[PDB]
């Protein structure tokens, strides 16, 4: 009698996030 078994499992994940919060406000009539 002969018997053999083989199991394999692989999982891959890669997150990514990139904020950008930049504001401009200027007032010395003139306004910005």
């Amino acid at each position: 009698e002969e018997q053999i078994e083989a199991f394999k499992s692989i999982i891959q994940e890669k997150t990514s996030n990139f904020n950008a919060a930049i504001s401009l406000k200027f007032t010395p009539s003139l306004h910005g």
Binding site: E1, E2, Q3, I4, E5, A6, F7, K8, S9, I10, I11, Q12, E13, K14, T15, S16, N17, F18, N19, A20, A21, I22, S23, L24, K25, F26, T27, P28, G32
Partner: protein
């Protein structure tokens, strides 16, 4: 920063990785051989043979 001239700037990054690996291997082997031979010089042709 701002001085009454204003300069604006802002950045925020986020990175993440999730890796996974799994392996399984199973082997099962069995071998059996049995032989039984009986030599009988009893003196019976058919009945002794049986």
């Amino acid at each position: 920063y701002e001085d009454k001239i204003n300069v604006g700037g802002g950045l925020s990054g986020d990175h993440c990785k999730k890796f996974g690996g799994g392996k399984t291997e199973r082997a099962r082997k069995a071998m059996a051989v049995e032989d039984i031979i009986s030599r009988v010089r009893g003196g019976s042709s058919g009945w002794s043979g049986g």
